[PDB]
Amino acid sequence: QCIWWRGLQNAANVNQTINNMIALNTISYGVRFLKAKLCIEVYAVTRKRLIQTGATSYYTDDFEQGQNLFIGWADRKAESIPITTPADLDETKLTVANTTLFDANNDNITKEEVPTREKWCHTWDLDVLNHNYLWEPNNLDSQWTLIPGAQAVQPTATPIGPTYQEIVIATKAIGANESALVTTIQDRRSYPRLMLSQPQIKDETDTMKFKYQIRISTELEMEHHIKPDIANPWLTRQTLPLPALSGDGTTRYVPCVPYETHVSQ
Amino acid sequence: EGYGKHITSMHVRNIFNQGNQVIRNIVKQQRYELLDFTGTEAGTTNLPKIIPYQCIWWRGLQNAANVNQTINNMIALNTISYGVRFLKAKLCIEVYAVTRKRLIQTGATSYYTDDFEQGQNLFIGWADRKAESIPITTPADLDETKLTVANTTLFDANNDNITKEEVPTREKWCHTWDLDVLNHNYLWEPNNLDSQWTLIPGAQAVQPTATPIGPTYQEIVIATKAIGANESALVTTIQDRRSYPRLMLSQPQIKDETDTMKFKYQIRISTELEMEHHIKPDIANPWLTRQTLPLPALSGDGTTRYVPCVPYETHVSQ
Amino acid sequence: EGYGKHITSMHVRNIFNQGNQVIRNIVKQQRYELLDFTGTEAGTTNLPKIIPYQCIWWRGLQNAANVNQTINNMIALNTISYGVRFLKAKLCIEVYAVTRKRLIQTGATSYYTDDFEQGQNLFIGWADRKAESIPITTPADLDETKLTVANTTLFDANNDNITKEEVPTREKWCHTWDLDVLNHNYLWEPNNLDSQWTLIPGAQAVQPTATPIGPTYQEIVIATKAIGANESALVTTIQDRRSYPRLMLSQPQIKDETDTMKFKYQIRISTELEMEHHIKPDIANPWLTRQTLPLPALSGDGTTRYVPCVPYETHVSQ
Amino acid sequence: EGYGKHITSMHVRNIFNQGNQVIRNIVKQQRYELLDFTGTEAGTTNLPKIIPY
């Protein structure tokens, strides 16, 4: 949900691709994201087996291929992601206290289990916008910037603005002289919270502890509409900014609504 | 390696329905009522009778003495439902009798008697081609028998602006409204319909500025709903402009001698309001509200509040 | 003589439905639970795990921590319904893991560790071909993880009376019951299912004389229901004899060294109980009860009460 | 042994394009200019005008 496809959680990962987008966003008046593709691979599954010599206890790591990684969708539930900083986006170190996929009383999660040699790869269609509108070019250097698509929920402590509601209304300031009125119809999009977890197994004392090796592949297709040959400052009327968590708040919560109901006509 | 006819490999499943389940209930209220234009007081005057179909009166809220188990169902279904979409509201009226008050004089005193006039018949006013509103003080004011507006009539000698259908005794007049305006997969917040200022679905863009409705009467809806202190929801929907003219009942206007003739009708007013409740999902989602927008309601501190009842919508060629 | 397209001659109608309306709700309860045969106490012993499908445990009554909005729907629908008929109860079990406790000794002390055995698998005991009952003290006793019966096992060296299907990890074992026995247009009294001694539909004619059920387990039902001080109702129905054997779960019985090997399984036990609620009619009829007979329940002052769980019914040629 | 419609066995992939991507831009320059052979100075003389394509 955060624009993490740039790998903003770390500066050590910048592919020339990102360096292209940074450039193309200088020469483009607007962009429309599409076909964001998340593709995950599990090379290994490793469990920490406690051991005791009776003098001391040391841990070792063994391969369990039978067990496998789980892809939680956090569907059928309303859960948000705290974001303090971009480093917090790292899915390896990102967690929410008192959350689990396996809930003994009521299991609300749809989850697909990913074995080692099988790769789990999901795709999002990020072009919601119609009526010939586009997204303001963003180098995606801010994590509070959230993907296209409208999940109408916003924290009142961090007002998004119009960009999560199907019917958009915004007054953009081109300059001191000219405001622009942007109005668009985009479809409500859910974007449930997606999470990864190990099997929950009580074993002895605390639950079993697995550590997975994965290769997480990402493709975010972006169509940049380049600025015209002659400067038009007023193309902005077709561009509306990316949704972003606003406010003075250091930590900010993305809605991640699970799903949208469907109604017959 | 396991054996059984029931066994099968594990596949992705979560049995929970994520809110796709629906329940269609019909809110039914049926009454045999007196329309008395004879009386000089308490809305029994010659003044026409207004049916507040625009207010959600289909629950028979004008009186607590009429609560059918149906309403007691809706009350329940509205506890377990995140949203509902009204549809096919059906008003069906029957005239069992027509009774006129014939003045009589013995010369010592004058007494009234009641005779049957079958030739004359009840009139259904639409108040079309005119802009008229209904004052609502309280729910008891919704009663169409006692509900009136001063200095109003169906028969206007100078200009007759009313479309009106005349209902004979043994003929029943039954009209139907399609109350599902909402599209783009939106629904109405569940309401037990205990408030009369709550108005039916459909968008008649007029609102009194003394009692601001909010967005729900304009085709393009924009609202920020408070789910909790933490999360606001932005509801935006396109619904069609709907007229909902003021519908009223009246007797013939006949000058006779002195004041006009006075009729009193016996009618059975049958009502069916079809409601499709979308039940809450198996797992609590507080944020389904983003697909629900509240019923239109007359707001403000005002005790008396006027429903627009716009007569009609023009049509334009493309 | 009246004019309109809506008008028509009066015909016999009463819009009220006289109870013909139905609502199908699915009671869903889904859990990821631990089956621990390692522990020496609190039903975690080697003793097999019993699933009390015979008790109405589909509400997850063994714990209040599991209440899905579904159950909160049934609670409501049972307020507005005169009767319900259960059907297509579906039990679906999944094994995510299989974990054995391997004893270890350093010679100073002995500690236990847990390893994965995928080759071994969970067993579904049917307790068929045998007559076994389930003690129920309280609803918490319904938990199939901690529910056990002393001196019971699936593997009996001398005579093995159990039909049992073995469930590997990635395979899910899912069985289904048809809970609509009732015919002749009869229904079950609405029950919020807050009592475990309440037992599922279907007639297993056995009852403990210490806890008399009443007529509801015999094909030919006869009961006098008290509607009020004034009116008794006589309910009589023909329903088919249903077995409902005791279903239980267990680990392999392996003697190894000293006590048998000890496995602990991780499972997700999925449940769908389809319920068709017949809503109360628009007008109160207290006497619909004549078509409803109460759910079977273990009665008496007894704290602990035994469900029969008859294994099977014989079949005879005509 | 894993379940999903998205899941599939792992195959050789490196999503990176190794330079096969191309962008066609048209460099456009458009002008309304004066050709003056009248002036006696500053290349405005009779001498022809050369376009340095």
Short mmCIF file of N, CA and C in Angstrom, two decimals, chain A residues 47 49-54 64 66-68 70 102-107 111 113 200-204 208 210, chain C residues 29-34 63 65-68 96-97 99 101 106 111-116 118 170 264 266 268:
data_model
loop_
_atom_site.label_atom_id
_atom_site.label_comp_id
_atom_site.label_asym_id
_atom_site.label_seq_id
_atom_site.Cartn_x
_atom_site.Cartn_y
_atom_site.Cartn_z
N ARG A 47 14.34 -23.82 10.60
CA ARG A 47 13.79 -23.77 11.94
C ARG A 47 14.91 -23.80 12.96
N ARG A 49 16.06 -25.10 16.28
CA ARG A 49 15.80 -26.19 17.21
C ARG A 49 16.62 -25.93 18.47
N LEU A 50 15.93 -25.71 19.58
CA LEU A 50 16.62 -25.56 20.85
C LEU A 50 17.34 -26.85 21.21
N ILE A 51 18.49 -26.71 21.86
CA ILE A 51 19.27 -27.85 22.33
C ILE A 51 19.83 -27.53 23.70
N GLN A 52 20.01 -28.57 24.50
CA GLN A 52 20.50 -28.45 25.86
C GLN A 52 21.54 -29.52 26.11
N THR A 53 22.73 -29.10 26.54
CA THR A 53 23.73 -30.02 27.06
C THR A 53 23.61 -30.21 28.56
N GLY A 54 22.74 -29.45 29.22
CA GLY A 54 22.59 -29.46 30.65
C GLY A 54 23.50 -28.49 31.36
N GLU A 64 13.35 -27.57 7.32
CA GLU A 64 12.03 -28.18 7.23
C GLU A 64 11.44 -27.78 5.89
N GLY A 66 8.86 -29.64 4.58
CA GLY A 66 7.43 -29.92 4.69
C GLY A 66 6.64 -28.69 5.07
N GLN A 67 7.13 -27.95 6.05
CA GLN A 67 6.53 -26.67 6.38
C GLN A 67 6.91 -25.64 5.34
N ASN A 68 6.11 -24.58 5.28
CA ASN A 68 6.20 -23.63 4.19
C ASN A 68 5.73 -22.26 4.67
N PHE A 70 3.63 -18.72 4.62
CA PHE A 70 2.23 -18.37 4.47
C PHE A 70 2.09 -16.92 4.03
N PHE A 102 -2.81 -17.03 12.53
CA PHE A 102 -3.53 -18.13 13.15
C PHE A 102 -4.13 -17.63 14.45
N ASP A 103 -5.45 -17.52 14.47
CA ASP A 103 -6.18 -17.06 15.65
C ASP A 103 -7.08 -18.20 16.09
N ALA A 104 -6.83 -18.71 17.30
CA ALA A 104 -7.49 -19.93 17.73
C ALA A 104 -9.00 -19.77 17.76
N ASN A 105 -9.48 -18.60 18.17
CA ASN A 105 -10.91 -18.42 18.36
C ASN A 105 -11.64 -18.21 17.04
N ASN A 106 -11.19 -17.25 16.25
CA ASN A 106 -11.77 -16.98 14.93
C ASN A 106 -10.64 -16.67 13.98
N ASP A 107 -10.55 -17.42 12.89
CA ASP A 107 -9.50 -17.22 11.90
C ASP A 107 -10.09 -16.41 10.75
N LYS A 111 -5.16 -17.19 3.52
CA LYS A 111 -3.72 -17.30 3.40
C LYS A 111 -3.34 -18.46 2.51
N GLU A 113 -0.19 -20.86 1.20
CA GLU A 113 1.08 -21.33 1.71
C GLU A 113 2.05 -21.54 0.57
N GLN A 200 2.28 -21.35 13.15
CA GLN A 200 2.20 -21.18 14.60
C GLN A 200 2.13 -22.56 15.22
N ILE A 201 3.19 -22.94 15.93
CA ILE A 201 3.30 -24.26 16.53
C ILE A 201 3.80 -24.10 17.95
N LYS A 202 3.04 -24.62 18.91
CA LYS A 202 3.33 -24.34 20.32
C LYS A 202 4.57 -25.07 20.80
N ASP A 203 4.83 -26.26 20.26
CA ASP A 203 5.95 -27.11 20.65
C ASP A 203 6.11 -27.10 22.17
N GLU A 204 7.34 -26.93 22.66
CA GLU A 204 7.57 -26.71 24.08
C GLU A 204 7.86 -25.24 24.35
N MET A 208 7.44 -22.73 17.90
CA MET A 208 8.56 -22.97 17.01
C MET A 208 8.92 -21.69 16.27
N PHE A 210 10.82 -20.25 12.89
CA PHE A 210 11.32 -20.46 11.55
C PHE A 210 11.97 -19.19 11.04
N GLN C 29 -17.80 -21.29 12.11
CA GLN C 29 -16.83 -21.17 13.17
C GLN C 29 -15.55 -21.81 12.68
N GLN C 30 -14.45 -21.07 12.75
CA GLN C 30 -13.21 -21.48 12.13
C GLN C 30 -12.08 -21.20 13.10
N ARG C 31 -11.21 -22.19 13.28
CA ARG C 31 -10.25 -22.15 14.36
C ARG C 31 -8.98 -22.87 13.94
N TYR C 32 -7.86 -22.39 14.46
CA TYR C 32 -6.57 -23.06 14.34
C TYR C 32 -6.19 -23.51 15.74
N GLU C 33 -6.22 -24.81 15.98
CA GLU C 33 -6.14 -25.32 17.33
C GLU C 33 -5.01 -26.32 17.46
N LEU C 34 -4.62 -26.54 18.71
CA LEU C 34 -3.57 -27.46 19.08
C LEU C 34 -4.17 -28.74 19.62
N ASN C 63 -16.06 -21.78 24.12
CA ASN C 63 -15.37 -20.56 24.48
C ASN C 63 -16.21 -19.38 24.04
N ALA C 65 -14.66 -16.52 23.61
CA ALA C 65 -13.72 -15.73 22.84
C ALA C 65 -13.95 -15.88 21.35
N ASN C 66 -14.60 -16.95 20.93
CA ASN C 66 -14.99 -17.11 19.53
C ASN C 66 -16.49 -16.89 19.44
N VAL C 67 -16.86 -15.70 18.99
CA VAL C 67 -18.22 -15.42 18.55
C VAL C 67 -18.07 -14.62 17.27
N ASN C 68 -18.40 -15.22 16.15
CA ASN C 68 -18.46 -14.49 14.90
C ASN C 68 -19.81 -13.82 14.75
N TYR C 96 -2.09 -28.64 9.47
CA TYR C 96 -0.96 -27.86 8.99
C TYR C 96 0.37 -28.47 9.40
N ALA C 97 0.41 -29.17 10.53
CA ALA C 97 1.67 -29.65 11.06
C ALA C 97 1.45 -30.95 11.80
N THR C 99 3.80 -32.89 14.86
CA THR C 99 4.94 -32.63 15.72
C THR C 99 5.00 -33.71 16.79
N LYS C 101 7.12 -35.34 20.15
CA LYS C 101 7.99 -34.99 21.26
C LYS C 101 9.01 -36.11 21.42
N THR C 106 20.76 -35.95 28.56
CA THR C 106 22.17 -35.62 28.68
C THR C 106 22.87 -36.43 29.75
N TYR C 111 15.42 -33.61 28.75
CA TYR C 111 14.57 -32.57 28.18
C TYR C 111 13.94 -33.08 26.90
N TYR C 112 12.79 -32.50 26.57
CA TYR C 112 12.02 -32.90 25.41
C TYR C 112 12.22 -31.90 24.28
N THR C 113 12.24 -32.41 23.06
CA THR C 113 12.26 -31.59 21.87
C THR C 113 11.17 -32.06 20.92
N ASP C 114 10.90 -31.24 19.91
CA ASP C 114 9.80 -31.46 18.99
C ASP C 114 10.32 -31.46 17.56
N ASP C 115 10.06 -32.55 16.85
CA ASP C 115 10.46 -32.71 15.47
C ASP C 115 9.25 -32.96 14.59
N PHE C 116 9.40 -32.66 13.31
CA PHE C 116 8.33 -32.86 12.35
C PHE C 116 8.35 -34.28 11.81
N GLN C 118 6.21 -35.92 9.00
CA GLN C 118 5.19 -35.82 7.96
C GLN C 118 4.66 -37.18 7.57
N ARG C 170 -1.09 -31.76 4.38
CA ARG C 170 -1.63 -30.90 3.34
C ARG C 170 -2.97 -31.37 2.81
N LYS C 264 1.84 -33.95 18.70
CA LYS C 264 0.94 -32.81 18.83
C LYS C 264 0.69 -32.24 17.45
N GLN C 266 -1.19 -29.53 14.73
CA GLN C 266 -1.81 -28.24 14.48
C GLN C 266 -2.86 -28.41 13.39
N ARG C 268 -6.66 -26.71 11.57
CA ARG C 268 -7.70 -25.71 11.45
C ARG C 268 -9.01 -26.44 11.20
#
